[PDB]
Amino acid sequence: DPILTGVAHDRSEAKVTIVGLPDIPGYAAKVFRAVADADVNIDMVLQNVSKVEDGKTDITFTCSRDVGPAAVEKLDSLRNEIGFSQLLYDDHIGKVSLIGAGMRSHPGVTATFCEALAAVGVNIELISTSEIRISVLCRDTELDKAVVALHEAFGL
């Protein structure tokens, strides 16, 4: 079975969402070159699928709260070139993560993680996972209780 080493939390980040990016080649490139040009370090990038109804999708990334505004300013300056409809900025997020390995063979782990947070009324704003981590963003004021819930749910 899987190994779970701990729970990590981070209150230092913001999320930037580029809304309504055209889902055709070259558009993520424009976004990320802009962010790199702005010298903004990126923690997580997440982009789900477009739906055929609009042929657009959103891209979210997280960065330190101190440089979020520079990222927003840069993307905003390239609205015509990039073709997005809106930017959202949220600097009130907490990131909470379950740390471990071998989680892909245990779908019950992801379910338990989400059940643990649900049971204490924490809303999962965003989810990203890997072989070694399940990470979610929640409101920063919900971060502590999310941490406690995961500690209890996983015996950590």
């Binding site: 927003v72 905003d76 409809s85 809106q86 930017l87 959202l88 900025y89 949220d90 600097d91 009130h92 997020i93 409101r139 920063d140």
Partner: peptide, 11 residues
């Protein structure tokens, strides 16, 4: 469309 400053629960 104007940037939305989200997360505050405010106007």
């Amino acid at each position: 469309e104007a940037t939305v400053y989200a997360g505050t629960g405010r106007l």
